[PDB]
Design a protein around this nucleic acid. Structure first.
Ligand code: DU5
Ligand code: 5UA
Ligand code: 5UA
Ligand code: MN
Lengths: 672, 670
DNA sequence: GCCGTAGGGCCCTACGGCT
DNA sequence: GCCGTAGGGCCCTACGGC
């Protein structure tokens, strides 16, 4: 793995650390080989501030580095035996390289301090706008970043042992609470180097990145960027329900050239999760081929699979090209993307969310679309509606895997505060199997409980004689039968006691521990149910208001044009003779505007008209269209005038989603 | 790996063998778990007929299959110890599936023969046109392939143990000539019998590899996966003037439209085309880490970026002018080119290597200036000898430079299509001070890993097989270019060590020329005069069809323009006519009726916008027709005479030589 | 120790002809 | 034992809560 330099003279040799081999080859092809050694790593390195010494010292990349440096570590560390006098960090110019970078400083800091103290450690500054250094051309990497004559290494300064320790303790250490509070305080949601300055800046930039632009969903359409991009990716290449499937690999290439500069499996498996009906309560993707199973199996590889939108997914993208939502430059400015989807149903809650961020994490369960909506409706009529009153409509989450939820206290605590624990329970019955003996039949398991892994924890529990009663465990699941897991019982054993044991002892009963965080105005926030429904319904007010302002503007732009087309066709031949006497396109435009009182666009419209638009009935079609538009226009000014009318539309259109898409509660909420 | 079934009665238990987890996942889903086990393998299993008995038993997949059957092997076999009374071969429905099939049988037949005797070996029948079984939903894989009520299996039948021994030895044994002679022999361009499957299946594989994988086309020099690559770039306008599109987009364009195969096959093959130490006239221009002379792979395709070079435009030039026959891609959803115009002789310029089935090919690059001088000579002399030609084309011309030792292998190679040609690094001895010397190498042979080469040397010094060396450094720099230094012990002879380096290490290597290409969709060993004769014949046709095409299009455009011209003449009559027809269709009939126009001159008049009644625009129409009229009669000239035509191919060939023709890199020492 | 978006990469097979 | 298209798949790491 080590491409070493040739000179064995420490003082003038330096070593570069890079994220892996894609970067290695460009750095090996660009280095001055005499004095510069290259070490590739393997992406995210161990956080050593967190992991203990047996893990540390048995980690492949740390070993190589210690070896590489010849210094030993900790006590043993010694500065004379250093094989290089410049150890240079040179990670991707991206937030994930900024993190790797803090992961290395932490490591150097806890095991190789004297090294930062002799001023041996440096950070390299490659130019932004590449995905990794494996995207740079050889010379260019060398010239802007590795050539000792034009390059700009930041040398790492340690100024205060006290400050440094604390810094590290907070940012990299296991206590999430002080790392979280570091963020709230410093976050702004919109050449020698001080190691504390660097650690603080670099980890923040990564945290703020992970929080707003990765791991947590938006309140308004329920999605995290990758899902938004994918789903935006499909829409743009109209890979719609009524059209045939399309190749998983083209979709993912497209999405990764255009909206998502992250790896292909982070994206392809995002798309798969959206296709699985045991993951999404209302699947957003339609899946052709092997897309996984409840025994944890991965999808086929993405050359085999094909996909397109679910019908429900169109209701997220409806009204998108009517100015409803702001577009933003994508990562490289060659392309535009939606900052949010219209989302004509409350996605966040219906399909829920799970996500791990920094200094926090989120976990929102799925719900039943019929309930949500009826709930949104009640609140549309009563801004003061209480949480007791919402749970008349929304009984509680509703899993794609169904099963039971034991009681309303947890639901209640979690809808009131955004936090609470809900005990999920498999659907199990006890039934006879002939010969005077019984069995347990579970046919439904909790949400996010791997069945084969649960079926092994059970086998394990009987293998290790921690449970008396069980005579055989089989998995009789199939497409025909559905999920069917059978557990025989030994003759005469009570089977209720045995089932109950399994609930306490196995994932057969799991706790979903709700933590309803989502992105409210690009800043993360713990919300309870009413907050969530309010932001969403605030979002629909803007989606309809803006679609209607759009249509009105469009409608007026048209009627102006028909005002001009009417006049052509009412003066046709003197229009024709105006054009013919004139030589250039501009001089014609000059003459019509002035002659028949036109605007630029009208004259322009008149000049773009085909002769087939002069056939006889054409005049009338026009007049017929002008009048209906005037009507139309009037209506849309009604709807922007009266807030109640505006908010009455939203309902109507909401009432129509429910009608078309709403389905029966799957998960039962036993009480007691 | 094995997903077992619930029952322990082999009676009713059967086990389905698939390609992997892409395919196993869709099979695990669709199965009846009671009676139906699944062992997923991993791609091509070892060919036992060419393997050693130690290797075979160590082999992971082999072992899992043995355990699965639980019957032991050879003399320790036991038919009463069989865990499933039906073993089912359920591979992808593609040539490689077939291949894997044949391989699996070979294992069965050599070690578990009594399993085919006992009637325990079956072959499943998934539907065709899926890349894998993983492309299939579970339920649909169940209704077709796995459900006892609908599935149509084949019980593999052994009939004659001796034709089956001769047959396995022939197809899967390590003597090509028989296997080759089998393809030639058989090449055309329920219950089942084992021999009869083996021939038909191996033949489906071999034939696929030979015509649609491993062998270039004598016309454009391209394997299918390269051609598809260059068209993918064309059909996304990824041209050199435009910026650099991401490697993942292309690779994804190509896969789904064109090439139903692994994405690492594509990207690596597009990679090769960007590297200036591999291609003599690099076809792809890449932004980022594209590998090294030291064996370094390219960077992952999420990072790298690429477009056409300038010279690939020439391979593609006029592709869309019906210069070439399009054909239906794999799934019937797109059109892809059978071949590219190839406006310079790519096959020979960039050369080619591919390991086929029953045959291989290995052709070297050449210098484009000489190649084109060659073709010119041939155009004005059909009866030119390989030797005449050789006055133009000295010999090959590697992109890595170096020295060729002699002309005899070359001569041989162009007369017959086969020969050895000995390649040497360019190397020189020079002082370093103090009497002492070094050896400094600067170009190295084609296809030689500069790193592997150095290590080999370092192993030889350490093991003392080579004497008189005191150091060994690679001082290659992008700035100074390739530079390998070897420090001779004082007083030692440097020229002897050197000729010792050339005997023992890749410093000298041989290229074994073997010029097998596809001539009319059929694999053939050709020679220099045929490589160039089949190229010229392709130029004649490419250019003749374009100039035909270009004439059909002008004559159509002329026609329409004679329409617009009549409109402008009688414009107020036209107005009149159109205003007094209620509908378009009634205008259309009246306009044709009225002014003696064809159906198309009328639509185009109905289409004309008004802006085209302005003075400039009027003149614009008159310019187009006089110009095009004159163009037409030029096209008509060319087509009238084979010689004016041929001379055109020469003036176009000459232009390209002029523009991209470059200096010789490899020296031929007499 | 697993839920799910992120960074990062390596190894078995077939096939032919040269060494 | 390498060359070059093909079949096929696996492991490490961060991050937070339970
Ligand atoms: O970026 C894309 N593909 C990347 C190829 C991913 N390889 C897929 C298979 N890989 C591996 N699979 C199993 C085991 C592995 C073990 C070591 C290294 C790679 C492995 C390594 C990564 C892509 C493909 C098509 C369209 C868009 C992107
Ligand atoms: O690395 C092994 C393979 C190499 N080798 C080169 N050429 C041959 C041929 N023709 N046959 C066998 N091996 C060849 O030599 C090394 C040792 O050989 C084996 O054990 O295979
Ligand atoms: N809620 C929980 N908290 C901590 N460990 C849990 C856990 N659930 C399962 N485990 C397993 C994982 C490890 O095998 C081991 C201890 O944790 C550890 O050291 O990583 O126990
Ligand atoms: Mn429990």
């Amino acid at each position: 793995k080590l491409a070493d330099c040739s000179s064995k003279s420490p003082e003038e040799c330096e070593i570069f650390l890079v994220e892996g081999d894609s970067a290695g080859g460009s750095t090996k092809s660009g280095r001055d080989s005499r004095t510069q050694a290259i070490l590739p790593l393997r992406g995210k390195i161990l956080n050593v501030e967190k992991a203990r010494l047996d893990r540390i010292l048995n980690n492949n990349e740390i070993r190589q580095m210690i070896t590489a440096f010849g210094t030993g570590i900790g006590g043993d560390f010694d500065l004379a035996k250093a094989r290089y006098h410049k150890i240079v960090i040179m990670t991707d110019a991206d937030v994930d390289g900024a993190h790797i970078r803090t992961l290395l400083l932490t490591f150097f800091y806890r095991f190789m301090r004297p090294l930062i103290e002799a001023g041996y450690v440096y950070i390299a500054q490659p130019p932004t706008g590449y995905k990794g250094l494996g995207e740079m051309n050889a010379d260019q990497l060398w010239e802007t970043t590795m050539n000792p004559e034009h390059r700009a290494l930041l040398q790492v300064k340690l100024e205060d042992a006290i400050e440094a320790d604390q810094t590290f303790e907070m940012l990299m250490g296991d206590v999430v609470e002080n790392r979280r509070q570091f963020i709230e305080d410093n976050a702004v949601y919109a050449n020698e180097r001080n190691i504390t300055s660097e650690m603080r800046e670099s980890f923040l930039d990564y945290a703020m990145s992970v929080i707003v632009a990765r791991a947590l969903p938006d309140v308004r359409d329920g999605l995290k960027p990758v899902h938004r991009r994918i789903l935006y990716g499909l829409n743009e290449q109209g890979m719609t329900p009524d059209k045939s499937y399309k190749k998983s690999a083209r979709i993912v290439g497209d999405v990764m050239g255009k909206y998502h500069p992250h790896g292909d499996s982070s994206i392809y498996e995002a798309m798969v999760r959206m296709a699985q009906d045991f993951s999404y309560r209302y699947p957003l993707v339609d899946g052709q081929g092997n897309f996984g199973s409840m025994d944890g199996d991965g999808a086929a590889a993405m050359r085999f699979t094909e996909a397109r939108m679910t019908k429900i997914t169109l209701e997220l993208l409806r009204d998108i090209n009517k100015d409803t939502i702001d577009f933003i430059d994508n990562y490289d400015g060659n392309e535009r993307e939606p900052s949010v989807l219209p989302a004509r149903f409350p996605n966040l809650l219906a399909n829920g969310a799970s996500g791990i961020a920094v200094g926090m994490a989120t976990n929102i369960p799925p719900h039943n679309l019929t309930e949500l909506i009826n709930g949104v409706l009640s609140l549309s009529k009563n801004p003061d509606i209480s949480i007791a009153e919402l749970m008349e409509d929304i009984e509680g989450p509703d899993f794609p895997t169904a099963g039971l939820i034991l009681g309303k206290s947890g639901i209640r605590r979690a809808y009131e505060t955004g936090r609470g624990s809900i005990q999920m329970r498999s659907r199990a019955v006890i039934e006879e199997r002939g010969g005077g003996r019984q069995r347990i039949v579970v046919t439904e398991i909790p949400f996010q409980v791997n069945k084969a892994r649960m079926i092994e924890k059970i086998a394990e529990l009987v293998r290790d004689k921690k449970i008396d009663g069980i005579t055989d465990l089989r998995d009789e699941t199939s497409l025909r039968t559905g999920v069917r897991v059978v557990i025989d019982v030994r003759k005469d054993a009570n089977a209720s006691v045995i089932l109950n044991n399994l609930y306490k002892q196995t994932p057969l009963q799991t706790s979903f521990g709700v933590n309803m965080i989502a992105l409210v105005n690009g800043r993360p926030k713990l919300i309870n149910l009413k907050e969530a429904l309010v932001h969403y319904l605030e979002h629909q007010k803007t989606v309809v208001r803006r679609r209607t302002q759009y249509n009105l503007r469009k409608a007026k732009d048209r009627a102006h044009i028909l005002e001009g087309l009417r006049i052509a066709l009412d003066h046709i031949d003197e229009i024709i003779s105006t054009i013919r006497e004139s030589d250039t396109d501009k001089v014609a435009m000059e003459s019509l505007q002035q002659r028949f009182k036109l605007s630029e666009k009208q004259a322009q419209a008149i000049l773009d008209m085909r002769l087939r638009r002069l056939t006889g009935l054409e005049r009338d079609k026009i007049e017929a269209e002008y009048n209906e538009l005037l009507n139309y226009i009037s209506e849309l000014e009604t709807i922007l005038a009266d807030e109640e009318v505006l908010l009455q539309l939203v309902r109507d259109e909401l009432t129509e989603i429910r009608d078309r898409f709403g389905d029966d509660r799957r998960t039962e909420i036993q009480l007691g």
